[PDB]
Structures are given as C-alpha cells and as structure tokens.
A = this chain, B = another copy of it.
Amino acid sequence: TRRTIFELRKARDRAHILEALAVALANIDPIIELIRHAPTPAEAKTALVANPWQLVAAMLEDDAARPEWLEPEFGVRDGLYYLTEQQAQAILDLRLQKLTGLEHEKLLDEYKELLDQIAELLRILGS
C-alpha cells in the first residue's frame, strides 16, 4: 500500500509537468510571441504564469492527476489553465525539435498513459 501511494505521487507530479507542455503546445504562437518579447527568461517566466491559457481539454479529463500540494489557484480553473512557476520553467527549457509533429504526439501519449495509471492507482486506492 505504501508503494501505491508513492506511484500516485510520482505519477501526479510527472503528469503535472507534462500538462503544462501539452497546453504550451496547444498555443505556441502566443507563447513564442510572449517569450521572444520578454527581455529575459525571468520576465518571460512571470508573463507565463501571469495570464491563463486556453486548453487538450477533452484529454485533460477526473480531478486526480493534480498534486496534493497543488495550490487551488493553479490548474484548470474555468476552462483556462493557470501555470505554476515550475511549469513555466519547463516550457522555457523546451527544445525546438520538440515542436516537430512526431515529437508533439510523444508528449500527448505519455501524458495520457500517466492519466491512465493515475486512474488505476486510485481504483486500487479506493478498493
């Protein structure tokens, strides 16, 4: 039982970062514009958490992939996504190649797999 709980914490956390990237790719044009206009990373990071983003919404289904530590001010809150400072960082660290087609899918895929595991880990939690 100790293991299960861990895997859920390991899972939620991992998926948390992959969400932000799936949303980042869901609106790259505006993200790029925002970044190539920020004088510095630090500023681009602020701008990123500052304003919410349109969702990946269908896929994004289940309020369990979110970290038990995730503040209530973050995440999907009214059809809009609110990035954590840590997630914005992840988006800033992305390598252009990750924008290719096959690469975009590998993210969505892993994200969906995590959401699957997180699902069964809960059935297992409940049961």
Q: Which A residues contact B (CB, under 8 angstroms)?
A: 28, 31-32, 35-41, 43-44, 91-97, 99-103
CA distance in complex: A35, B32 (Å): 13
Q: Does B28 contact A100, Cβ atoms closer than 8 Å?
A: no
What is the CB-to-nearest-CB distance from A42 to chain B, in angstroms, rounded to a whole number?
9
With A28-B36, A36-B28 in contact, do A96 and B101 touch (Cβ < 8 Å)?
no
B residues near A91, Cβ cutoff 8 Å: 96
A-B contact pairs, 14 of them (CB 8 A): A28-B36, A31-B96, A32-B32, A35-B96, A35-B97, A35-B100, A36-B99, A40-B101, A43-B100, A44-B100, A92-B95, A92-B97, A93-B96, A95-B95
